[PDB]
Design a protein around this nucleic acid. Structure first.
Ligand code: MG
Ligand code: MG
Ligand code: MG
Ligand code: MG
Ligand code: MG
Ligand code: MG
Ligand code: MG
Ligand code: MG
Ligand code: MG
Ligand code: MG
Ligand code: MG
Ligand code: MG
Ligand code: MG
Ligand code: MG
Ligand code: MG
Ligand code: MG
Ligand code: MG
Ligand code: MG
Ligand code: MG
Lengths: 134, 260, 182
RNA sequence: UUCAUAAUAACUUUUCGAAUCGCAUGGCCUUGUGCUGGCGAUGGUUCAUUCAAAUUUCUGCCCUAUCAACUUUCGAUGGUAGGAUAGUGGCCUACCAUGGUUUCAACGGGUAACGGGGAAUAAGGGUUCGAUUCCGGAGAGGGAGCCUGAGAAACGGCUACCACAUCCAAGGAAGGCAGCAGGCGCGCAAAUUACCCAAUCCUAAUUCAGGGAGGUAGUGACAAUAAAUAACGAUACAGGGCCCA
RNA sequence: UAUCUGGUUGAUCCUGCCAGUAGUCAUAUGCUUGUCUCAAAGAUUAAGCCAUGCAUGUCUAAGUAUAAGCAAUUUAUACAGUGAAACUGCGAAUGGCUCAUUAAAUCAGUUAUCGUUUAUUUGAUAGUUCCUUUACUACAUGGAUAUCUGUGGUAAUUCUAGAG
């Protein structure tokens, strides 16, 4: 029914990261939400953009509906994006993979263990072997 | 107790930073630097909020460590670098040069300048000492020292520094009837010509300052910073000519400028 | 901690709780302008009281003093923006009066009912609650919103609301379904 | 200022004056792989500088006379000299002097006393509360003493004693939740062994590592904010003004 | 919104105090609690006791790498890519918590350091080191310690002896 009109308030060229900081203004009557992926897709004819260097954050829906303010960062490169953007955002977008460590608590426990002990491990193993035998 | 304070809380922060009191509980404490913690302005406060060139601390770090940023001469790798008064910030990208000068109401206004005036710093003389071997050296207000100056340089005098080298090109002698800048207190960022000195014995020395709108204001020599001759400045001043306008005047201005 | 998150009281409770005349007046006001809470009336009175205090302070400072020139004028402007104060009436004495009735009249609850759209105040309230009132393009479900002179013409039904365009509501759909399967 | 500094005479278990690192890698010639040379990091004495730090001056504090004199043994007050201290000084020690504070509340005794900013309280003037978001200060069972370090008399550093208590094969060992959650106990009286460093920020050799600092939620009627729990309908008997009774 | 009403009497004026009333950014608590933004929360009593787990560690191009560790392909024979681990270097004296002390002390504002120390950051900064000073002085670079390999001791723990 409605094609959704997207204009951009407060446009900074931003040369320090080559990105473009602007306020994304979405107008979607009848439509439920923006769906950020769609907006990203759209952002291509707007500033000669690619579905890689387009970033959107914020996107709180205004009261009543229709209007939705956000914030956008279009980088000059994919490389640029993958050297200035926080990793979580990239993961959300679908560019860098979901980075896996462990639970914080487990990590902390490991650290504590490391602290409580001295050496590489081989010595400890040897000691254990001697305790196991005698 | 115990030692020096490392952190700083986002409420205990100096006023003319205008940091968001709610979002965040710690402010940036500027590191050990040239200017006083109270007078100085750190880069993250500036870059993130005054210019809006960043939105996060990480962003600021990225901006800085890639070494596009230059203050007076060098790059300064650290975030919390103290940049006080008259300091020049040259950003390598698009050559957007700034001098950190106060505004009418006391804020470090984003004053955009070209490479011509953004080549020299003005520096207030703190003290003149004869150092080792018998060498006179002049002390700038930004802690900086220049060895071998003009012999007629005294305190409260102001000095040009060419930034590329630690050298004096010219200086403005302290004289009653020489246009001036005020840097602290209730009256800050206003500009006048200095009417008369009050010499005084044993600490605190006042000068009476008069602007273009015939409004006298008296201030200590601590906050007084000479800019040059009456009529001609050595530094381009912020919009509104940096004259402390009355509240009524401000209201009028607001009511006159409804343009879209 | 964070610190500056300050919570304001916004209303004053009367010192005598069963002073009958006052109570009656309050009730009358509620009846006139459809009010769930006496705290709404109290809230508005508190606001008015604050304004009065400011006015009093200004008056205390002499005629054509700087403070009087500023703050009083600002207050007058503010009042004009809300409406309430008449365009002839801009002299601080008027502010000191202002009644209590006027604030309960220049608010969405009454401002919707003022030109029609509801034919009852309770109806209007209900309408406001259920999102079918827009200030211009933006939906307001605040009954005691306080409409503000410049927006006084742009109060209308929302774009996404029954009896104002868009779509049929939950009962209409049911009716349609019934019609389909008879 | 006997200041900075200069100058002479010396003096010192002679303090320092780079036996370091990476990315670059060109200029000219006597062709040595020569002399040179561009940034960049660390490191180093002096003097400024900020972050500070101790001291410090003035002025101001809650009750009580059922607190009238108080301090001087074992410094009270001052002088003089040293000692010590980063430096001033009863800050110590030697030696002399006999002062010093008080009825304008000294000195004692209390406190259900951390001090401010502040908070509540609706004329004005105040009252009462501030353990608590910011700043100071204090303390990390209780007292003591130190070590390293620029910076502690640290407390997630040690040392001993006192008190409360863990593990033992009884010979020995580690202790310190007023950090966060969690438990016991007390009591009128108070939350989840939750998640994450993304934001805020500091710390590191350092963009990258970390931070129950911090934030996000669970609980949560602490208070404060905002407001639903219906809205009009056609009727069927009577109102309230009335064309006239 | 500078406000008062009930109670001494048989009734009256007071004086008075007791009630009520209104608030709490003051607790507790009583039943009731559909929402939204906000969010204080072991202060009061015992700075009482505390099981367990976790709250300060850290590395870049650039202080040390022969991990007998991965990595290796397009850069890698003195190393050249990350990189645990351990020394050296910093930092653990910040933050956080708490209010038992403490009454001219803290503290507030206020001066001063011409009465001092200040790692760090920022600037500047040692042409002068030698010692009869031509047979002279490694400066085109001078000597032993710890990570790991093994032998372990021990009821155990940020204990660690011996050797290389
Ligand atoms: Mg002496
Ligand atoms: Mg107090
Ligand atoms: Mg307090
Ligand atoms: Mg207490
Ligand atoms: Mg305890
Ligand atoms: Mg101790
Ligand atoms: Mg600690
Ligand atoms: Mg320990
Ligand atoms: Mg706890
Ligand atoms: Mg409770
Ligand atoms: Mg915490
Ligand atoms: Mg609940
Ligand atoms: Mg009164
Ligand atoms: Mg009777
Ligand atoms: Mg009472
Ligand atoms: Mg307790
Ligand atoms: Mg170490
Ligand atoms: Mg602290
Ligand atoms: Mg106490």
């Amino acid at each position: 029914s409605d094609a959704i009109t997207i204009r951009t308030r407060k446009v900074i060229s931003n040369p320090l990261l080559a990105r473009k900081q602007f306020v994304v203004d979405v107008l979607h009557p009848n439509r439920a939400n923006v769906s950020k992926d769609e907006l990203r897709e759209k952002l291509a004819e707007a500033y000669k953009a690619e579905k890689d260097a387009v970033s959107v954050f914020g996107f709180r829906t205004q009261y009543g509906g229709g209007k939705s303010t956000g914030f956008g960062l279009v980088y000059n490169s994919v490389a640029d994006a993958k050297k200035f953007e926080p990793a979580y955002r990239l993961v959300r977008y679908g560019l860098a993979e979901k980075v896996e460590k462990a639970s914080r608590q487990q990590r902390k426990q490991r650290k504590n263990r490391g602290k409580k002990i001295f050496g590489t491990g081989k010595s400890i193993a040897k000691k254990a072997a001697r305790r196991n035998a005698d | 107790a115990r030692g020096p304070k490392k952190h700083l809380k986002r409420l205990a922060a100096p006023h003319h930073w205008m940091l968001d009191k709610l979002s965040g509980c710690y402010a940036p404490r500027p590191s050990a630097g040239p200017h006083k913690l109270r007078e100085s302005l750190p880069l993250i406060v500036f870059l993130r909020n005054r210019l809006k060139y960043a939105l996060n601390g990480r962003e600021v770090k990225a901006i800085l460590m890639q070494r596009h940023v230059k203050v007076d001469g060098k790059v300064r790798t650290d975030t919390t670098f103290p940049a006080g008064f008259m300091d020049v910030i040259t950003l390598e990208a698009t050559n957007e040069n700034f001098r950190l000068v106060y505004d009418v109401k006391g804020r470090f206004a984003v004053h955009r300048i070209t490479d011509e005036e953004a080549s020299y710093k003005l520096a207030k003389v703190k003290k003149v000492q004869l150092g080792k071997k018998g060498i006179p050296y002049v002390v700038t207000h930004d802690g900086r020292t220049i060895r071998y100056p003009d012999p007629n340089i005294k305190v409260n005098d102001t000095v040009k520094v060419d930034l590329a080298t630690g050298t004096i090109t010219d200086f403005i002698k302290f004289d009653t009837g020489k246009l001036v800048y005020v840097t602290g207190g209730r009256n800050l960022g206003r500009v006048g010509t200095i009417v008369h000195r009050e010499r005084h014995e044993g600490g605190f020395d006042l000068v009476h300052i008069k602007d273009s709108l015939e409004n006298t204001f008296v201030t200590r020599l601590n906050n007084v910073f000479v800019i040059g001759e009456p009529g001609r400045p050595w530094i381009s001043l912020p919009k509104g000519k940096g004259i402390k306008l009355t509240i009524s005047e401000e209201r009028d201005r607001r009511r006159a400028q409804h343009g879209l | 901690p964070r610190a500056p998150r300050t919570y304001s009281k916004t209303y004053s409770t009367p010192k005598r709780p069963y002073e009958s005349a006052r109570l009656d007046a309050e009730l009358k006001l509620a009846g006139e302008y459809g009010l769930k809470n006496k705290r709404e009336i109290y809230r508005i009175s508190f606001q008015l009281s604050k304004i009065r205090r400011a006015a009093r302070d200004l008056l205390t400072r002499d005629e054509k003093d700087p403070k009087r020139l500023f703050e009083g004028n600002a207050l007058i402007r503010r009042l004009v923006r809300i409406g309430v104060l008449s365009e002839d009436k801009k002299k601080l004495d008027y502010v000191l009066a202002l009644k209590v009735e006027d604030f309960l009249e220049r608010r969405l609850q009454t401002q919707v009912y003022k030109l029609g759209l509801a034919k009852s105040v309770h109806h209007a309230r209900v309408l406001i609650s259920q999102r079918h009132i827009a200030v211009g393009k933006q939906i307001v479900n605040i009954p005691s919103f306080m409409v503000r002179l410049e927006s006084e013409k742009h109060i209308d039904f929302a774009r996404t609301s029954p009896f104002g365009g868009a779509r049929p509501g939950r009962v209409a759909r049911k009716r349609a379904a019934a019609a389909g399967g008879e």
